[PDB]
Every structure is written in structure tokens, then in C-alpha cells.
Design a protein around this ligand. Structure first.
Ligand SMILES: CC(=O)N[C@H]1[C@H](O[C@H]2[C@@H](O)[C@@H](CO)O[C@@H](O[C@H]3[C@H](O)[C@@H](O)[C@H](O)O[C@@H]3CO)[C@@H]2O)O[C@H](CO)[C@@H](O)[C@@H]1O[C@@H]1O[C@H](CO)[C@H](O)[C@H](O)[C@H]1O[C@@H]1O[C@@H](C)[C@@H](O)[C@@H](O)[C@@H]1O
Ligand SMILES: CC(=O)N[C@H]1[C@H](O[C@H]2[C@@H](O)[C@@H](CO)O[C@@H](O[C@H]3[C@H](O)[C@@H](O)[C@H](O)O[C@@H]3CO)[C@@H]2O)O[C@H](CO)[C@@H](O)[C@@H]1O[C@@H]1O[C@H](CO)[C@H](O)[C@H](O)[C@H]1O[C@@H]1O[C@@H](C)[C@@H](O)[C@@H](O)[C@@H]1O
Ligand SMILES: CC(=O)N[C@H]1[C@H](O[C@H]2[C@@H](O)[C@@H](CO)O[C@@H](O[C@H]3[C@H](O)[C@@H](O)[C@H](O)O[C@@H]3CO)[C@@H]2O)O[C@H](CO)[C@@H](O)[C@@H]1O[C@@H]1O[C@H](CO)[C@H](O)[C@H](O)[C@H]1O[C@@H]1O[C@@H](C)[C@@H](O)[C@@H](O)[C@@H]1O
Lengths: 309, 307
């Protein structure tokens, strides 16, 4: 027969958020018709086709590389993006934006570091990329950082953004940003995103998406730190390696507790890459820290999940 | 008491999101946008939701008194309710009943009667529902006009909606945005008491939308306007108040000339319809076709595909 499908045998705490480089913490479900679940990172079919902007490196998510150019009389820099290899980025390539680009609207704070090539001297500065900005145009090849210096970065020098966490302005409404479910305009104002991974939704009565959730570090104020992915990064990696052909619509997984030996809940892993459970309402799953998912079988869409207690 | 939908053709009915007639049925996928309109929201047993009300002519209008904002051609309107009484911002509604539920530039005519002598005026006026001054829930909206002089304070003023407008210099059909709720209480405000967002929740299903074409007044506007129930359905359900026997009412869309069934659909108790189709599709329907309620069914009834 065909190569058997599997998911990694890893606990939730053992795995990594696929939308920002931090560990998963906890599983969450809620209704999703009041927002658009259409993230671009962490997108992979069960048989291993990466969609959207999703790539394999769990550390390259939300990072940026290239050379900078100071913007006269401000503390801001434009970065001309390079690819991961440091090869020039191609804006004609059939993707929404550079792989790893952030897929939520918000202000990401991190550190911009630079090596001068002629002598190996080295600098680093606190820097913020605002993905909702008029100047956030990764698909065009340019992005802009606000920083705390006006003189120190040099032109024509390898520069890198390391993301750290998220920010919101305290004088406004608490948790008003980031908005994890609003994609940026990858090409700036008045232009359409292209080649997106499909939006997703539960398509069976009584079902909701299962999200794998982390808390982003916050750098200032009160910023909404929940960040939900559709697949752990290790799943993307796993599926990409294994490339097992989907035998039917849904892969039925059981979440098991090894201590009791008991099945805790069952979920559907849709072929095109997300998870749904049977439940109505918002719910932080309570799980044994060493519980894990295991694959049971390929079933039809119309298979009825036992309610998640 | 048996449930029913009114014996009306689509062309006989009215859009419940702007005061104009229905033209057609449209279906498509809707996971890439939030389907959460606040007008034309009613349960089958006749509970009105969101900002929905009964008058098809009072959708997208405002009433109240005006104030001029010095050195502009703009006026601020303090809203009254439909009855000309004080709008109570505490009331458990997203915004005054009949407020527009999409981000857009609506163009109309602001008109005024001076009570004491019966003199009157009309001026072209536009409301921008994504403006920072669009605060209908707070009791206050703002219009832009063609006079800096004419309107008087303390008098009864009425906005009549006429069409939507869009800025031609920008990319076409970029506005209005029918599926983005306005911020009813302004910037950094949570919408409250909203009618729930809706989605198909059955494999192979898509929402069915009752569509019109709003008139355009300028620019290259997106004139599509989709509503989940026709206003006459909302009115019918309010009257009949028929209790729901299950989760889903099965309607047949029937051609009475031939008596044949064109397609079937699910009318969910909370007030929206789905059909069994994958993809965008303009429906082709005989001009005197109408909807007929056939039975209650459970959530697992499979529809015959709509061709
Ligand atoms: C601020 C800085 O860059 N300091 C580094 C220093 O740079 C000075 C030396 O090159 C100096 C020679 O001793 O030349 C100076 O330039 C002239 C000015 O142009 C002139 O107007 C004025 O009259 O005099 C000065 C010099 O006297 C340079 O500014 O070189 C030092 C040795 O490389 C190096 O140790 C020093 O590195 C900095 O140390 C400061 C403490 O002063 C802080 O630690 C900074 O973190 C650090 O700079 C950082 O590393 C350096 C190498 C570089 O990569 C920076 O981008 C980075 O921020
Ligand atoms: C423009 C207007 O209001 N016209 C109406 C006119 O108003 C003028 C008369 O009150 C006039 C007395 O005959 O007083 C004028 O005020 C002074 C100025 O203040 C002064 O600076 C200048 O030196 O001289 C003028 C007067 O000579 C008023 O402007 O009253 C007329 C009788 O009521 C009335 O027929 C007329 O109504 C307007 O008719 C114009 C034609 O000129 C158009 O049809 C307008 O549609 C119309 O005004 C409209 O109806 C009136 C009653 C009012 O409700 C307006 O708000 C509305 O636009
Ligand atoms: C008045 C008008 O039509 N304005 C619109 C403008 O019209 C010019 C363009 O279509 C242009 C495109 O090449 O062709 C021009 O015609 C030629 C002729 O040779 C001659 O007229 C002139 O000498 O040379 C020009 C150029 O070769 C048209 O006059 O097109 C704009 C671009 O789309 C458009 O934005 C503009 O629309 C108007 O915008 C202004 C903003 O200042 C106002 O909002 C107007 O209300 C708006 O017009 C209204 O909306 C537009 C979209 C349209 O529906 C109109 O019918 C309506 O009045």
C-alpha cells in the first residue's frame, strides 16, 4: 500500500508555534465566523505541500535580511530585503511575500544587527517593524524599521532583524493589537495580496477549529499576546519530509494521555492542513503535559467526532 | 401554528440592507470574509437581531437635528430614533435601528423643515461610514455637503440615502466594503450586541445571498449588496412568530408555471440560507419563481445539489 501517514509523537509543550519563533503552550478552540482564519505561515497539506509563505526553519519566521538605508531626519531605516541565503529576493515568484514574512498586522519589536564587511565590526539596535504600515511592502522587496539611532547603521552592509515580541500603545484600548487574524498588505496600500493559502473554516455541524496557541512576549504596554497557529511547525516539517498521500478527506487523530492510557478527545486533521474538534464555544483545553496526538485512520468528512469533554 | 415564507418572487422583494429592490440570487464561498451584517437579521420565529427593523424605507437613513462645523461644509447630526424621540445610547443594540452596516461612502440628500413657518431645504450630502466621526451608537454622525450656510439648528432633519460613491483616482471597486462593519462607537470602541456572524457548516455548502446593485453616484464603486434575508421575509417572520420545530427549514424554490422544483435550500432558524454548491455562481431562475417551505429537518439533511 501507500506510505502510511503519521503525525510526530510530540507533546504540545515540545513543539513550536509556526507563526512566530516561540514554543507552543496550550490548545485552544473557539467559534471562528467573526474573523478570517487565513494565516500564511504554518500552512502545509498533510502530504507535504507548503502553502502561503510557509517555510521549514522555525527560527527564520518573522525575520528580515538585507541592506539598510537611512531615511533623512528620522530614526527610521528602509530595508531592501534579501532572501534567506542572502541571494536577492525575487518579487515575481509566485508567493504572497518572502517566506517567513509575518502574517498578522501588528508592531513587532526586535533587534537589527549588522556586520561591516571590511573589518568585522558589529552593531545592534532595538528596532520595530509595523506590519500595518503604509511602508510595509515585503512583496515589493522593501520594508521599514523604526529604531533608536540616526547615525549608526551603514549602507551596503548585511543587516538582519531578530524578532522578539509585540507592542501596543498603552494610551489606547488594551489588547487592541496585534490583530492576529488580519493579514498585512504585502504590497502596500491599494493592492491585492496574491497566491494566498486558502482561508479555512469548520464545515461540519458542531465543529470548531482546534488552534495550537502560544503567548507572544510583549515588549511594551498591553498587547494582545495570543497567537494561534493551524499546525505546529514540527508538523509542517514532518509532513514535508514524509509526503504521505492522503487516503481520504480527513485524518482522524486521537489525543492520548499516556498516564491513564486513555483517549482524551478526537479531532479531524483535514487534508489541506488544519484541525477541527466537536465543541461549541471558547475553551482552553485542559491537557496532561505529556499527552500527544496519534493518527488513527483516514475517514470521510461526514464522520462524527465524539464531543471533546 | 405552521411555518411559512411569503409567496413572492425575488424581483418582487426588497433588499434589507439598503432600500432598493432585489435583483438576483448569488452564492459563493465566504471563509475569506466575515459575514456579519446587522440589517436583515431575524430568527425564523421572528426575533429581530442586530440593527434590524421593519420599515424597508428607513434602512440607511438618519433623523435628528444638525449643527454646522465652522469653516467646513460639514454638519454633525444628533440622532433621534425612528419616532423622532431621543436616541438612548444605553439601549442594548449596536446602533440605532436601521444604521448602515458596511464601510462606505453613502450619498444622499439631507432635507429640513423649519417648524414655525413650513419652509424647507434639500442639499446633496454624503456620509462616510468609516470616518472617525461616524459614531451613531454614541448618538452622533457627520455629513459632508454643498452648503456652509443653509441648514438651521433645533429643526427636524432627515437623510435619505441614494447611492454609494468611490474615489476614481484609486483602484476600482475598492469601496464600499459590504462585509466590514463600521465602528459604531468610533475609533477604539468595541461593537456590542451584534447579530452573530454566519457561515455554512455543512460539507459542500455555501451561503445563498439575496443580491441587489446599489445605485452608484460617482467613481467606480462596488455596487454589489448582499443580504441574508429579504426584508419581506423579515417582516413575515416578525408577524407570524411561528415556532421552529428543528434547526433547519427546508425550502424548495419552485417555478409555478411548470410546478417543477428548481433547487432546494436550507433556511437556518437563526435567519440565513445555505445551498449545496461549490464556487461563485449567479443563479439563473425563472422570473416567477418563489420559495416554499416544505418541512423541518435536522442539521444533517443533505441537499440535492443546486445546478
Ligand atoms: C562609538 C564607536 O564606534 N566606538 C568604537 C570606536 O570607534 C571610534 C574609534 O574608531 C576611534 C579610534 O579610536 O575613531 C572614532 O572616530 C573619531 C570620530 O570620528 C571623531 O569625530 C572624534 O574626534 O574622535 C573619534 C575617535 O576618537 C570612532 O568613533 O572604535 C573602538 C575600537 O574599535 C571600539 O572599541 C568602539 O566600540 C564602541 O564601544 C563603545 C564605547 O565607546 C560602545 O561599546 C559601543 O557599543 C561600541 O561600538 C560598537 O562596536 C563598534 C566596533 C562598532 O561596530 C559600532 O557600530 C558598535 O556600535
Ligand atoms: C435663497 C432664499 O432663501 N430665498 C428665499 C428668500 O429669502 C430671501 C428673502 O428672505 C429676502 C426677502 O425678500 O431676504 C433675503 O435675505 C437678504 C440677505 O440676507 C441680504 O444679505 C441680501 O442683501 O438680500 C437678501 C434679501 O433680498 C433672503 O435671502 O425668501 C423668498 C421668499 O421666502 C423665498 O421665495 C426664497 O426661497 C428660495 O427661492 C430661491 C430662489 O431665489 C430658490 O427657489 C430656493 O430654493 C429658495 O430657498 C428655499 O426655500 C426657502 C423658503 C428656504 O427654506 C431655503 O432654505 C430654501 O433653500
Ligand atoms: C469629470 C470626470 O469624468 N472625471 C473623471 C476623470 O475623467 C477624465 C478621465 O476619464 C480621463 C482618462 O484618460 O479621460 C478624460 O477625458 C480626456 C479628454 O481628452 C478630455 O476630457 C480632457 O481634455 O483630457 C482627458 C484625458 O485625456 C476624462 O475627463 O477620470 C478620472 C480617472 O478615473 C476620474 O477619477 C474622474 O472622476 C471624477 O473625480 C473627481 C475628483 O476630483 C470627482 O470625484 C468627480 O465626481 C468624479 O467624476 C464622477 O465619478 C467618476 C468616477 C465618473 O463616474 C464620473 O461620471 C462622475 O461624474
Amino acid at each position: 500500500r501507500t506510505k502510511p501517514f503519521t503525525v510526530p509523537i510530540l507533546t504540545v509543550e515540545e513543539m513550536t508555534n509556526s507563526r512566530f519563533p516561540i514554543p507552543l503552550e496550550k490548545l485552544f478552540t473557539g467559534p471562528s465566523s467573526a474573523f478570517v482564519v487565513q494565516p500564511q505561515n504554518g500552512r502545509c497539506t498533510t502530504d507535504g505541500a507548503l502553502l502561503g509563505t510557509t517555510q521549514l526553519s522555525p527560527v527564520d519566521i518573522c525575520t528580515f535580511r538585507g541592506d539598510v538605508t537611512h531615511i533623512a531626519g528620522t530614526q527610521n531605516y528602509t530595508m531592501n530585503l534579501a532572501s534567506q541565503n542572502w541571494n536577492n529576493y525575487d518579487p515575481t515568484e509566485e508567493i504572497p511575500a518572502p517566506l517567513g514574512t509575518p502574517d498578522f498586522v501588528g508592531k513587532i519589536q526586535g533587534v537589527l544587527t549588522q556586520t561591516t564587511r571590511r573589518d568585522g565590526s558589529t552593531r545592534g539596535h532595538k528596532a520595530t517593524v509595523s506590519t500595518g504600515s503604509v511602508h510595509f511592502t515585503p512583496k515589493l522587496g522593501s520594508v521599514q524599521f523604526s529604531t533608536d539611532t540616526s547615525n549608526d547603521f551603514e549602507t551596503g552592509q548585511n543587516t538582519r532583524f531578530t524578532p522578539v515580541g509585540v507592542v501596543q500603545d498603552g494610551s489606547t484600548t488594551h489588547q487592541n493589537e496585534p490583530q492576529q487574524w488580519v493579514l498585512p498588505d504585502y504590497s502596500g496600500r491599494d493592492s491585492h495580496n496574491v497566491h494566498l493559502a486558502p482561508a479555512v473554516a469548520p464545515t461540519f455541524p458542531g465543529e470548531q477549529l482546534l488552534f495550537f496557541r502560544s503567548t507572544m512576549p510583549g515588549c511594551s504596554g498591553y498587547p494582545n499576546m495570543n497567537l494561534d497557529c493551524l499546525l505546529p511547525q514540527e508538523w509542517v516539517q514532518h509532513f514535508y519530509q514524509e509526503s504521505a498521500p492522503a487516503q481520504s478527506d480527513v485524518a482522524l487523530l486521537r489525543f492520548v494521555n499516556p498516564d491513564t492510557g486513555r483517549v482524551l478527545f478526537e479531532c479531524k486533521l483535514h487534508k489541506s492542513g488544519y484541525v477541527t474538534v466537536a465543541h461549541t464555544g471558547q475553551h482552553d483545553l485542559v491537557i496532561p503535559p505529556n499527552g500527544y496526538f496519534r493518527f488513527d485512520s483516514w475517514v470521510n468528512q461526514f464522520y462524527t467526532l465524539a464531543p471533546m469533554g
